[PDB]
Amino acid sequence: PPHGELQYLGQIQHILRCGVRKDDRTGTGTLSVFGMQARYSLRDEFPLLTTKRVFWKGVLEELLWFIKGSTNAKELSSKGVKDLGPVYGFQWRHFGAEYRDMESDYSGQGVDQLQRVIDTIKTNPDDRRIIMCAWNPRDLPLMALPPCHALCQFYVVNSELSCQLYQRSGDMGLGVPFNIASYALLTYMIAHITGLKPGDFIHTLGDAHIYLNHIEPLKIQLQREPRPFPKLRILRKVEKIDDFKAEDFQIEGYNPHPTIKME
Template sequence: MFVNYLKALIILHLTLLSTSGDIYLTRSSWFGLDVLGSCQLEIGAYAKVTRRSYCHRLANMATDIYQNGSNGNAQHDPQRTYQVVVAATRDMGIGKDGNLPWKLPSDLKFFKEVTMTTSDPSKRNAVIMGRKTWESIPPQNRPLPGRLNVVLTRSGSFDIATAENILMCGSLNSALQLLAATPYCLSIERVFVIGGGQVLSVGLTHREEGDLGPVYGFQWRHFGAEYTDMHADYTGKGFDQLSAIIDKIKNDPDDRRMILSAWNPSDLKKMALPPCHMFAQFYVENGELSCQMYQRSADLGLGVPFNIASYSLLTCMIAQVCDLLPGDFVHAIGDAHVYSTHVRPLEEQLQKQPKPFPVLKMNPLKKDIDSFVASDFELVGYDPHNKIEMKMAI
């Protein structure tokens, strides 16, 4: 079966973004990959998963604080986020013998800029650190100027307790609770967790490396089931949206409720990243199957080309299973953005002359959506231009 490329209607609203995400890395290499700009970088799955897990752990702590605070103070700005500042070696080392593994002026300057910058001149930021991190700072440089220093220690220290611009807390949770309460919630704009290893480990055990939580595939096939981890067997659990859609297409093709949703509000906090392409509707007309997908957030440089290809392929697969021809793929985007590090590569791409589209060939014997394997697909006439490198931005 040969299928020509699907027509794609893309509704775009371009927004130029510079920095995104909740984690900052210094200009040193992490995993040996270069940092672009202030915090745009290419990063492995481990870093992505643990970063998100850490932020989720902090977010959960913050939620508990706002919901269960016992000091009677009015809770201010419940949407506050917490940032993590990390510089790591290729082997994920963040220190050696109680000190930083390197001393680079550009790193220290970048750290200072990130942790001191505020949008409101009347406010300042807070930096949370463990006792060993505090002690690793040269005495003449502590407390870190221009920031509220929060030191986590259970032993107590006269020097710390009597110094100005310093708070002592027994745990990360108590520190977040203190900063969420009056008067600090009114004077602190951002809160940075700056280490060390024991403090960072609080959030790095939330998910195993590679475990993204109940994301796209889980919601498509097991919506409503309780997610434990990526190794569990979820057969027969939850609602199988994909199978239900295929059944509707075959038996009630005029149905207007053939919806595939990856957006499950009750599971968002368990996901490494909330779904970007989140909602698809299928439509049958004149023997053709079309798909319209809504995407809340779209990385035009790297993500969208894959989103178009993957949903077009899914439409082709479902069409074949249901003895239909593929129709249109309609792509609606809410927040479409081009990262600053992608501008030049995309300008280069726009200068290239488009080539003819390839033809997708699928194994015509496959009539079960779960029976497809990679060898069932072939792109005929695929002749791409040379690669244009774009770094993943987080």
């Protein structure tokens, strides 16, 4: 059976060949295709890309940060990837709640989208509404009813948990490999505390794009052969989503090609 990273490589190749020129909001050029989808098995493997080394520590650390609902950059400062008000954390844990301070008590204020996903999996695994959204923080003061940046839908059949991420746009060079790992990790976490096995991660894009200055690096990456995906081990029986710590996770057999710096 074919290696799942081949889907990601084929999407890069399709955009390089068939993408059209389109500016982003800063007027920076991309090659763009609208509407894409890839499926990554989470069964006995973990889709951390191998055609370049992906910074797994930052994936883990930043997800854990989102899970505690933090609006404080310092809790993410001296770790790897370098007073807020929004971010994916506050929206995942406290949606629509009156913001006051970053050192403020928000316990049971707003909608807890993440706990609601977990509770629904437990109370009604057949539910077609197991959905959590994240917003780009810059959109929040911009308009009423601002559109989400990303919607994540979970799905359960035969004791397997699957996840589909819809992103309205996806930076294929930098953001996409990191998001694949991120939502695959989230799925592993939620599966673990709901007593299910990870199933599939489906990645769906609106504007799938490559920045012009990533073209040469990505063209080199395209000629690298994927190595078998690693496995992800959770080292401890963990009971609630808030209990996970970085040390509960071990990536095993990760054997990637060298780091590529995009930009």
